[PDB]
Amino acid sequence: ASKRIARSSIDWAKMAESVPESQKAMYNQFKAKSDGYIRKALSYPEQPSPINWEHYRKSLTNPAMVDAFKKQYEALKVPYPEDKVSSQIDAQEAEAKKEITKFIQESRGRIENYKAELGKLGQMIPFEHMTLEDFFEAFPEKVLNPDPPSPNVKKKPFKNN
Amino acid sequence: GFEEAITLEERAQKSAEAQIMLFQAKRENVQFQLEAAYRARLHHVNNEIKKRL
């Protein structure tokens, strides 16, 4: 065989284009630990050495033992090992799908907010033609009667003590 | 800053897509490990039969 052990893999090229290095440094483990499961996959084929039964027939006076061992070898076939991690991986995949849907929704909301802010700043009156009240309408911090005052109403003339 | 924030949201969406690729690679790696263990037990059986011969 050697199909899904020796001559298959997953494309890591698209994997490295998203990971933010220190945020996803476990990918350095994931590309390496799975490579260990590739390194043992370099070994371990289905049939590592076919048995030359003719050689044992020639090398033994009684070839009935060779025929019996050949019949016992052909009568035994090992199947694929049992799996119990498939349901766990499917559950993790479903939880990932829910979290990705939530994160996409939050990204859509943030994109809509950023596009609204960009459009509002594009549509603002330029500062050359801006009266001091249109500036205070577009920037509603202003300076009010129930507000921390100063003769130089600045970003740090009050409190800060 | 607004344009950079938009592009960073796009990168976050691409990171989510590559997370899907990660989970697919996870289940592929599990199948690879299980098949490799099957090959080792086939090798162990063949080695024992050769030792008996």
Phi-psi region of A159 (alpha: psi -120 to 50; beta: other; left: phi over 0): left
- The overall longest dimension of chain A from CA atoms, in Å, is 116
CA distance A156 to chain B (A): 25
Question: Which residues of chain A lie closer than 8 angstroms to B11, CB-CB?
Answer: 18
User: Rg of chain A over CA atoms, in angstroms?
Assistant: 36
**Experimental technique used?**
cryo-EM
With tokens 């050495």, the residue in question is A49
User: Rg of chain B over CA atoms, in angstroms?
Assistant: 23
Q: Which residues contact B24 (CB under 8 A, 6 or more apart)?
A: A10
With tokens 């476990």, the residue in question is A26
Resolution (angstroms) stands at 2.7
Beta strands in B1-53 (DSSP E): none
Contact with chain B for residue A17, Cβ under 8 A: yes
- Which contiguous run of DSSP H or E holds residue A32? helix A26-42
Handedness of CA A66, A67, A73, A74 (dihedral sign): positive
Tell me if B18 and A80 make a contact (CB, 8 A cut-off): no
Scored b (16 or more CB within 10 A) or e, A42-58 reads eebbbeeeebeeeebbe
